[PDB]
Amino acid sequence: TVKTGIAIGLNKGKKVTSMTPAPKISYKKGAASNRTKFVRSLVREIAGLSPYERRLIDLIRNSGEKRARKVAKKRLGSFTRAKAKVEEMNNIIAASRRH
Amino acid sequence: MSKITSSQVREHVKELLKYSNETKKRNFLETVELQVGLKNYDPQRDKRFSGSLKLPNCPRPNMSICIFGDAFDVDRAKSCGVDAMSVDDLKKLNKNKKLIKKLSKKYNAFIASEVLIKQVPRLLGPQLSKAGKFPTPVSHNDDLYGKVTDVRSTIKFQLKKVLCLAVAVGNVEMEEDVLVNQILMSVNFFVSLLKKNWQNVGSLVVKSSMGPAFRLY
Amino acid sequence: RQNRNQEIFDANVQRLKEYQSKIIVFPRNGKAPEAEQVLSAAATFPIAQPATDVEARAVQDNGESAFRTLRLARSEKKFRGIREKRAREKAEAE
Amino acid sequence: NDVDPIELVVFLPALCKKMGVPYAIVKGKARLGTLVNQKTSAVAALTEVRAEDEAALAKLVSTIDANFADKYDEVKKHWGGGILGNKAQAKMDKRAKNS
Amino acid sequence: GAYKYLEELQRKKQSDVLRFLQRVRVWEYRQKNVIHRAARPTRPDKARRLGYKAKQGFVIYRVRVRRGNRKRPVPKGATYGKPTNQGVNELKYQRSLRATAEERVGRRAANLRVLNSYWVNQDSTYKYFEVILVDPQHKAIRRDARYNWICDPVHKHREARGLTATGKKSRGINKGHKFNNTKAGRRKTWKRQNTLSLWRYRK
RNA sequence: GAAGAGACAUAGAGGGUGUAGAAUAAGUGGGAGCUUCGGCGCCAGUGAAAUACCACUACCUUUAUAGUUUCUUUACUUAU
RNA sequence: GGUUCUUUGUAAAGUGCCUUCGAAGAGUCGAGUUGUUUGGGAAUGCAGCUCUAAGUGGGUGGUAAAUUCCAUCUAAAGCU
RNA sequence: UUGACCUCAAAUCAGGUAGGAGUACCCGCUGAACUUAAGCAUAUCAAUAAGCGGAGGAAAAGAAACCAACCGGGAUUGCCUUAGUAACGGCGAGUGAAGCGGCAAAAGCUCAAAUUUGAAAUCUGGUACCUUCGGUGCCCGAGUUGUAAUUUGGAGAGGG
Ligand SMILES: [Mg+2]
Ligand SMILES: [Mg+2]
Ligand SMILES: [Mg+2]
Ligand SMILES: [Mg+2]
Ligand SMILES: [Mg+2]
Ligand SMILES: [Mg+2]
Ligand SMILES: [Mg+2]
Ligand SMILES: [Mg+2]
Ligand SMILES: [Mg+2]
Ligand SMILES: [Mg+2]
Ligand SMILES: [Mg+2]
Ligand SMILES: [Mg+2]
Ligand SMILES: [Mg+2]
Ligand SMILES: [Mg+2]
Ligand SMILES: [Mg+2]
Ligand SMILES: [Mg+2]
Ligand SMILES: [Mg+2]
Ligand SMILES: [Mg+2]
Ligand SMILES: [Mg+2]
Ligand SMILES: [Mg+2]
Ligand SMILES: [Mg+2]
Ligand SMILES: [Mg+2]
Ligand SMILES: [Mg+2]
Ligand SMILES: [Mg+2]
């Protein structure tokens, strides 16, 4: 936030007049565009689902989130990707169920 | 996290209270029911509790509550619209367990006093815990009307072998705003304390006393 | 490199205008006069350490106890996490 | 209908259906190429015609829609292949008759 | 364009459509020779973003490489030394199968220069790669300043010296604390760190 | 692919021990009618339990459907 | 230096403000495991096999993990 | 019958190119043991010798998926230093970097992802003539399964 003027503590350091530089165009490298969202949605509906994605949707429908996330962590390599993949499969499940 | 959407449950109520009042009328008081079905839960081994949750308003203004205490509590009962028996009558009456059940069922619930904390469960308690309403001491200086009006809206979450614990939140005659806030807080607190939280509960039930079988979830 | 320090940004902009004042850019198709090549730009425009303070001024003692200040800064940082945790649990209790 | 690799066009019927553009799968990248002065075009499209051809375009679009876009939802559900060779098919229908 | 659809579609390798194409193609490649010229890239979008151009002087080859470990090629598994070097079977080549694929394609077409390469397919026995090559003698490349860099002799057999994308990955050429041993070239770093530096006026 | 059998989810289906209230009573509180019936529960007896109504079904398979796929042998042919 | 080609240009480049946008590399990242290697220590890089992503995403932040932030860059293509 | 297209061939077809040598230095792969540990197997020697493949006048690296935690630096390389330090190690013998700081030298950039679509605007080759490290016209071909122009994140594009 703002430096406290002394050498230790939470916001330690020298108080200086700040400038807030203009945002770099990088730092948006991971941003969904309208083109990418359209293309990914079309490819999703063309290609369908992977065998492990179908297993995950069955797991969500049957045992729930915890067991789905465990298998998703196994199939992917990490818990953060397991979670993101499972709320993704939740979205396909919800969209298929509604209407 | 509140999985239950108040935006949808409010219009579910707005399309159900009309059913229970205007299009299908019944002079007999209609009582709104709330049932919660579990998923992957074992009350036999897991912790079991008799939850109590006070609601903002009284569900039914015609309920029967009985106080045990001395003559003072007996006379104040008439100033609070409740009944009260003596002590020596039930001392000489404790022998028959079937009569204790017969006097149990006439009243929805019982409360006691502090002079009788150590003695009422010894004689009255055996056949009274079968109904499931544990009596509570009420003091002479403590307002009897205030205590009863506190316990009128209490919600008994008596966890037992059956996973469909039916408790009535209230009626349709009263306003809907408090009823919606009632069902939102009751479910939110119970799910909050649940060990697996939202994943524990499997079903949600909001019922009209004569309405058909409608499943919200 | 990014600018987040106004003092450094002003110093560099003053550096740039000062350099512009002391160069001659010969035209791409002019006469291009000789201008006595100076080998070092760095020696022409040396980097100066700014002035931190004045040589002398008034003693202002407010009884703060600078040592106490350092100790308390260390303690508040060391105990922020636990104190926020006890605050959060105390708030959530009943 | 004969582009290799088929990945280049395999999304085109879906894209045309999504965007409401009438399409026809037609025999011959060589045939498409000969109408654009190439050896192979792999795709051809009309974005506008003259008044003397607007009716012909409309009637042909109607027939092409009845054949490709109006069947897209059903065609998307049906797997090709699984056809047998001459000898296997013979030896299958003899055992269908025999037992 | 279509390349964005191709790029997204190629990432769905275990969908029905790509699984079917994969099985048909892997059979086709196995029937052909271990190394053979490809008439065109089977992944036009992937070839493009590696620098392929649809013009005279750009060549695609297809090569398959045997999968697995590098068995130490000693007689009867007899390593003659300490037990730490007795291993024969669980030993790994320090360059990838993609590097082996480029090296063999470059040897077959030593008149060309390997630009890059990409995966197209695998089965249990082989991995299948397509290698992008450029003709440095071809005028369409010798002109055209965007590609006549590959005409300089310093780019002879880049894949042999680890100068392609898989080469630099295998060599460890990357910035940061993770690549201290291999940033400027590990053997060059090892020499510099094991050199005794002596000055005229000794320090 | 199959004889197909599970198992999973996606709808319906029914019934059920002792006692006796007023009836083969497996679970809740509700407090008295919507109803062709004045039948049924109710302020009444009573049994562990109130009994119309299950809200879910505490419990199922006895059976039907497409979603799945544990298989268990079995067949297929195009990979090998 | 100097001599010419002198529509030798409506040809190219740059610059301000507003609005809408801003495509950015997949058997790759990453993970498990095996081997090797490193000062890199619950794993420094490399390589084989299995699994295999996302798009306010992804990598890194020298102790494994969950939750919450923050900082810092923008890989899987290339020349000097 | 015929004319394409795709793929695959043949020719002492037109024009080219690779090989081998040298290898001090350079880029990789493969890879020891003697030795030390007062024995010895991990370790050490050593990511070395030998062996294999590939370059140039230098090579490689190189314009951050960097370092940092600062009031922040700012491609790469090399030197002084960090430092025989953090760390690794029968935690034995031994081994062992990096950031910051001062210097030498300094230089920045290019594609893929975008409809030219009122016009493939792009290129090899053959041939003829010339001002011949090339140019111009003509023709055949390549190329839309995408060659030019336009943009590369520092941005930048479209429109006004
Ligand atoms: Mg040893
Ligand atoms: Mg071995
Ligand atoms: Mg170089
Ligand atoms: Mg090292
Ligand atoms: Mg000296
Ligand atoms: Mg990138
Ligand atoms: Mg090795
Ligand atoms: Mg080692
Ligand atoms: Mg920074
Ligand atoms: Mg080397
Ligand atoms: Mg010894
Ligand atoms: Mg010795
Ligand atoms: Mg010895
Ligand atoms: Mg070593
Ligand atoms: Mg040697
Ligand atoms: Mg030479
Ligand atoms: Mg030099
Ligand atoms: Mg380079
Ligand atoms: Mg950059
Ligand atoms: Mg630097
Ligand atoms: Mg020192
Ligand atoms: Mg180690
Ligand atoms: Mg060593
Ligand atoms: Mg421009």
Q: Where are the domains of chain A?
A: 16-99
Alpha helices by DSSP H, listed for chain B, are 6-18, 71-78, 88-91, 97-105, 120-123, 125-128, 144-152, 176-193
- Rounded CA-CA distance E47/E6 in Å is 11
Angle, vertex CA A23, rays to CA A20 and CA A25, nearest 5? 165
Q: Collapse the DSSP code of B51 into the 3-class scheme (helix H, G, I; strand E, B; otherwise coil) and give the result.
A: strand
Checking phi first, is residue C67 left (phi over 0); if not, alpha (psi -120 to 50) or beta?
Answer: alpha
CA of E46 to C1' of F64 (A): 53
Q: Collapse the DSSP code of D22 into the 3-class scheme (helix H, G, I; strand E, B; otherwise coil) and give the result.
A: coil
Query: Which chains pack against B, by 3+ Cβ pairs within 8 A?
Result: A
Distance from CA of A9 to the nearest CA of C (A): 5
- Rounded CA-CA distance A2/A11 in Å is 7
Give CA E120 to chain center in angstroms.
13
To which H or E segment does residue B110 belong? strand B109-111
The answer to whether strand F lies under 7 Å from the CB of residue B185 is no
| 8 Å CB contact between D26 and D32 | yes
Q: Which strand H nucleotides have any atom less than 7 A from protein CB atoms?
A: 3-9, 15-19, 26-34, 41-44, 47-48, 53-68, 70-81, 96-98, 110-115, 123-125, 141-149, 153-155
Give the β-pairing of E126-134 and E113-122.
antiparallel
Nearest CA to D8 out of A46, B146, E3, A63 is that of E3
Q: For residue B166, give Cα distances in angstroms to B64, B92, B204, C43.
A: 19, 36, 11, 89
Residue A74's contacts (CB-CB under 8 Å, 6 or more residues apart) are: none
Ligand nearest to the CA of E84: 1
Q: For residue B177, give Cα distances in angstroms to A40, B184, C13, E137.
A: 44, 11, 64, 85
Q: For residue A18, give Cα distances in angstroms to A21, C6, C16, C47, D15.
A: 9, 6, 21, 22, 50
Q: What is the DSSP letter of B197?
A: G
Q: Which two tokens stand for residue B59?
A: 């569900």
Minimum CA–CA partner of E2 in chain A: A39
Question: Starting from the edge strand earliest in sequence, which strands make up the sheet with B65-68, in order?
Answer: B83-85, B65-68, B109-111
To which H or E segment does residue D91 belong? helix D86-98
Q: Collapse the DSSP code of E91 into the 3-class scheme (helix H, G, I; strand E, B; otherwise coil) and give the result.
A: coil
Considering only the beta carbons, identify the residue of E17, E42, E43 that sits closest to D10.
E17
Amino acid type, E112: L
Nearest CA to E102 out of E47, E172, E159 is that of E159
Q: Which two tokens stand for residue B130?
A: 């079968």
Q: Which residue spans within D13-81 are E strands per DSSP? A: none
Whether D5 sits inside 8 A of E21 (CB atoms) is yes
The phi and psi torsions of E138 (rounded to 5 degrees) equal -85, 135
- Rounded CA-CA distance B134/A15 in Å is 65
To which H or E segment does residue B109 belong? strand B109-111
The answer to whether strand F lies under 7 Å from the CB of residue D88 is yes
Nearest CA to A7 out of C5, C49, C63, C77 is that of C77
The answer to whether strand G lies under 7 Å from the CB of residue A46 is no
Q: Long-range contacts: A51-58, Cβ < 8 Å, 24+?
A: A51/E14, A52/E14, A53/A85, A53/A89, A56/A85, A56/A86, A56/A89, A57/A89, A57/A92, A57/A93
- Rounded CA-CA distance A68/A56 in Å is 6
Cis peptide before D5 (omega within 30 of 0): yes
The phi and psi torsions of D91 (rounded to 5 degrees) equal -65, -15
Residue C70's contacts (CB-CB under 8 Å, 6 or more residues apart) are: A6, A7, A8
| 8 Å CB contact between E122 and E128 | yes
Residues (75-114, chain B) with CB within 7 Å of strand F atoms: 98, 101-102, 105, 108
B156-178 exposure pattern, b = at least 16 Cβ within 10 A, e = fewer: ebebeeebebebebbbbeeeeee
Q: How many CA atoms lie within 13 A of E150 on its CB side?
A: 29
- Rounded CA-CA distance B73/B93 in Å is 20
The answer to whether strand F lies under 7 Å from the CB of residue B174 is no
**Count of C-beta atoms within a 10 Å radius of residue B137:** 17
Query: Which chains pack against D, by 3+ Cβ pairs within 8 A?
Result: A, E
The structure tokens 């009897």 sit at B144
To which H or E segment does residue E165 belong? helix E165-171
Q: For residue E38, give Cα distances in angstroms to A77, D40, E26, E29, E105.
A: 36, 18, 14, 10, 12
Q: Collapse the DSSP code of E12 into the 3-class scheme (helix H, G, I; strand E, B; otherwise coil) and give the result.
A: coil
Residue D17's contacts (CB-CB under 8 Å, 6 or more residues apart) are: D23, D69, D72
3-class secondary structure for chain A?
A: CCCCCCCCCCCCCCCCCECCCCCCCCCCCCCCCHHHHHHHHHHHHHHCCCHHHHHHHHHHHHCCHHHHHHHHHHHCCCHHHHHHHHHHHHHHHHHHHCC
Give the β-pairing of B109-111 and B65-68.
parallel
Q: For residue C60, give Cα distances in angstroms to A10, A13, C57, C63, C64.
A: 26, 22, 9, 9, 10
Residue B19's contacts (CB-CB under 8 Å, 6 or more residues apart) are: B208, B211
The DSSP bridge partners found for residue E117 are E131
| 8 Å CB contact between E131 and E97 | no
Q: The domain A16-99 belongs to what CATH superfamily?
A: Ribosomal protein L36 (1.10.10.1760)
Q: Which two tokens stand for residue A37?
A: 């969202």
Domains and CATH numbers, chain E: 1-203 (3.40.1120.10)
Residue D52's contacts (CB-CB under 8 Å, 6 or more residues apart) are: none
Alpha helices by DSSP H, listed for E127-164, are 139-142, 158-161
CA of E111 to C1' of H130 (A): 34
The answer to whether strand G lies under 7 Å from the CB of residue A25 is yes
Kindly compute the dihedral angle of the four CA atoms of residues D17, D20, D21, D23, in this order, to the nearest 10 degrees.
Answer: 30
Q: Which two tokens stand for residue E130?
A: 């397509």
Q: What is the DSSP letter of B116?
A: T
Q: What is the DSSP letter of B30?
A: P
Nearest CA to B204 out of A89, B162, B17, B188 is that of B188
Q: For residue E10, give Cα distances in angstroms to A33, B102, D8, E13, E44.
A: 20, 77, 11, 6, 11
Residue E154 CA, ligand 17 centroid: distance in Å? 15
Give CA E184 to chain center in angstroms.
20
- Rounded CA-CA distance D62/D54 in Å is 12
The structure tokens 């003899």 sit at D94
Closest residue, CA to C1' of H7: E39
What count of residues does chain C have?
94
Q: For residue C83, give Cα distances in angstroms to A1, C69, C70, C88, E52.
A: 20, 19, 19, 9, 61
Whether A49 sits inside 8 A of E8 (CB atoms) is no
Q: Which two tokens stand for residue D29?
A: 């990248």
Q: Which two tokens stand for residue E17?
A: 């459509």
- Rounded CA-CA distance C88/B91 in Å is 51
To which H or E segment does residue B154 belong? strand B154-158
Residue A86's contacts (CB-CB under 8 Å, 6 or more residues apart) are: A56, A60, A65, A68, A69, A72
Nearest CA to B17 out of B153, B183, B217 is that of B183
To which H or E segment does residue B203 belong? strand B201-207
- Rounded CA-CA distance A85/A91 in Å is 10
**Count of C-beta atoms within a 10 Å radius of residue E106:** 21
Residue E154 CA, ligand 15 centroid: distance in Å? 23
Positive/negative CA dihedral, C12, C16, C17, C21: positive
| 8 Å CB contact between B199 and B47 | no
| 8 Å CB contact between D29 and D3 | yes
Return the number of CB contacts < 8 Å for D and E.
18
| 8 Å CB contact between B52 and B214 | no
Angle, vertex CA E165, rays to CA E161 and CA E169, nearest 5? 85
Q: Long-range contacts: E38-42, Cβ < 8 Å, 24+?
A: E38/E62, E38/E130, E41/E130, E41/E132, E42/D5, E42/E120, E42/E130
Query: How many helices and strands in chain C, by DSSP H and E?
Result: 4, 0
| 8 Å CB contact between B159 and B200 | no
Q: For residue E176, give Cα distances in angstroms to A72, D8, E184.
A: 32, 40, 11
The DSSP bridge partners found for residue D96 are none
Q: For residue B34, give Cα distances in angstroms to B6, B22, B168.
A: 15, 21, 6
Nearest CA to E62 out of D11, D39, D5 is that of D5
Nearest CA to B208 out of B21, B33, B87 is that of B33
- Rounded CA-CA distance C77/B176 in Å is 50
Q: Which two tokens stand for residue B157?
A: 């979450």
Q: Which residue spans within chain E are E strands per DSSP? A: 35-38, 58-66, 113-122, 126-134
Q: For residue B191, give Cα distances in angstroms to A64, B33, B157, E164.
A: 17, 18, 12, 58
- Rounded CA-CA distance A57/A79 in Å is 17
Q: For residue B211, give Cα distances in angstroms to B37, B182, B207, E30, E138.
A: 19, 20, 7, 69, 86
Q: Collapse the DSSP code of E126 into the 3-class scheme (helix H, G, I; strand E, B; otherwise coil) and give the result.
A: strand
**Count of C-beta atoms within a 10 Å radius of residue B181:** 14
E44 CB neighbours in chain D (<8 A) are 5, 8
- Rounded CA-CA distance B125/D72 in Å is 73
Nearest CA to B126 out of B157, B150, B94 is that of B94
